[PDB]
Design a protein around this ligand. Structure first.
Ligand SMILES: *Cc1c(COP(=O)(O)O)cnc(C)c1O
Ligand SMILES: *Cc1c(COP(=O)(O)O)cnc(C)c1O
Lengths: 344, 344
């Protein structure tokens, strides 16, 4: 047993219901036509083989010869590759400078304009929050900047859906995407996608021969342990978001402790998500003389039953406090106190 | 306990090690770079989110505006929808008439030649075996036809890989696809794709920005319970193919008894696969006078611990005798004899 602080896994721990259900192996229609569209606050929802497949599905459905897509600079590499696969030209809206690193409804709107000059822009996307810093840009705002430029907006909420409350309609965007494995306590690759009833005729167009199948999801009804676990955990995930405020308070507290210890939290301040990016100089210098150098931090934590940071990182790194109990939060803050002290 | 005779599932039973492995939850690099290519007899091999994703990936990589793909009429709807999603024109090579329903090298060649008349044919595809009849066309010969016509050939081996020995090199085709959940005792949506090295830089092309990620696969390493079960069941799957001949002798034995009862197996005769499609005019007639109507068969079967045939089907239906013991085979045969006597 280890205390896990990997941002990729904290929101993906399997539920008891899901763990036990993954064994045995369903109201799937109910789940996607009713429960899911509600939960996402949108008209139509579909399950995909991952958030990046959901993104590619809409990009590909809207792409046109040489068209463009504008996505924030803090985007997920999958958002970018998905764009390359859809054959779109890619424009990145720049981020605020250190240590905010934010995507402002202005820089975004400018980038849109300065690019609507390079060719047709058929899509725009903001990552909410982004996977590098856990910053939550102002989507309600950006959804307007797009609604008043007539470009459709896709919200990449891989780190939002299943963690904090979200509503496509409350946001005012065209598409919303979520990840079952990083924020919905489900397994294998699985994603969720929600859109306005007006796009189901495009993104969810049917086959000319198999009028019952959807072209963009390759007629996949995608059953397997994947959908089962997603569903099994859904009740708990629904409840779970009612604690988001606690989660953020807990993260804020933690960063404040790191602050005192010398390692600084970047991006949103106060931060508004469990995923935090830290600048730990006192640790980078200790790596110059440490037992294993770059890998000292890892070894040290591995020893202290703590896994979650990419081994070899010391000057900068990200982590998540998501499902940690207060004792576990303290234990980690303390591991850092000790390690720093130990080395000089 | 229930005896399973459903074709989608007989080759997908989760392995002992896969079940347990799924519990706890790796040499993934060894698997895809060395083990898998060896098992498929190909240069390069990748893991994908289902055979259909693998099929779409190459269709998308080879497509050109208004180009064509020719695939056999017995093809899987996912093969067809994949082609629609890639925006290609589809030409179906026709099958021989009842009772055979075969795809012949001759009709394939004719179809290619006639299609080459309507535009560029960028790809051909034979399903081996088709999922309706379980017929095994002569791929070796269809592959030669394709070579001499200069069109790449994709072999859809969803129902072959992990059941019978297949080698892309032996067949002489360009691409081969398999399905982990239906023929490799693995869970969730997962597939396998092998190709000749020369096709690797087209289909497995990297991203411009993230030179380490492959576009067609959306840079997805693909971890999860999915790949876990696939690797966990692989040793058994590699050895289980050494028993293919038993499996077909068993299937032929089954079909022969069925005929004695009035229900006739269509397609290849002698049959060369565990998947069999039957014509049971006797059951269809009993349904016109029987207890539950079209559901009487489901009922009688469900009642005898037998699952596998879509409920409401009595005239024609497919089934698989894949991993059944000779006693389970005999049991299912006897169940049919009885259900027939019981109603006449
Ligand atoms: C992981 C991630 C994705 C894609 O998630 P999948 O379901 O594995 O495709 C997209 N965006 C961000 C920010 C992510 O971290
Ligand atoms: C099920 C099936 C496929 C695709 O299977 P997946 O792994 O779910 O994509 C392809 N071809 C045939 C004949 C099939 O039966």
């Amino acid at each position: 047993d280890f205390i896990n602080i990997d941002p990729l896994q904290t929101g993906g721990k399997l539920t008891e219901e899901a763990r036990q259900a993954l064994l045995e192996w369903p109201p799937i229609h109910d789940f996607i036509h009713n429960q899911l569209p509600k939960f996402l606050g949108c008209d139509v929802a579909r399950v995909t083989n991952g958030a990046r497949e959901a993104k590619f599905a809409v990009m590909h459905s809207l792409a046109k010869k040489d068209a463009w897509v504008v996505m924030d600079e803090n985007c997920h590499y999958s958002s970018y590759v998905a764009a390359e696969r859809a054959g779109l030209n890619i424009a990145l809206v720049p981020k605020t400078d250190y240590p905010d690193y934010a995507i402002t409804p202005e820089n975004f709107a400018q980038t849109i304009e300065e690019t609507k000059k390079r060719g047709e822009v058929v899509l725009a996307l903001i990552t909410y929050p982004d996977g590098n810093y856990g910053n939550l840009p102002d989507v309600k705002k950006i959804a307007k900047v797009c609604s008043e430029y007539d470009v459709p907006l896709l919200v990449n909420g891989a780190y939002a859906i299943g963690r904090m409350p979200v509503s496509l309609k409350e946001i005012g965007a065209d598409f919303i995407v979520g990840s079952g494995h990083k924020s919905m306590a489900a397994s294998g690759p699985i994603g969720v996608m929600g859109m306005k009833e007006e796009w189901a005729e495009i993104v969810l167009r049917r086959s000319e021969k198999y009028k019952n199948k959807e072209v963009e999801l390759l007629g996949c009804t995608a059953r397997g342990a994947t959908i089962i676990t997603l569903m099994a955990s859904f009740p708990h995930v629904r409840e779970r978001i009612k604690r988001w405020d606690e989660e953020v308070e807990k993260a804020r507290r933690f960063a404040a402790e790191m602050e005192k210890l010398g390692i600084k939290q970047l991006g949103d301040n106060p931060h508004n998500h469990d995923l935090m990016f830290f600048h730990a100089e006192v640790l980078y210098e200790i790596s110059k003389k440490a037992k294993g150098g770059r890998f000292f931090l890892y070894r040290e934590l591995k020893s202290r039953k703590i896994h979650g940071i990419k081994p070899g990182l010391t000057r900068y790194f990200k982590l998540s406090t998501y499902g940690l109990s207060d004792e576990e939060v303290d234990y980690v803050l303390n591991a850092f106190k000790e390690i720093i002290e130990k080395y000089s």
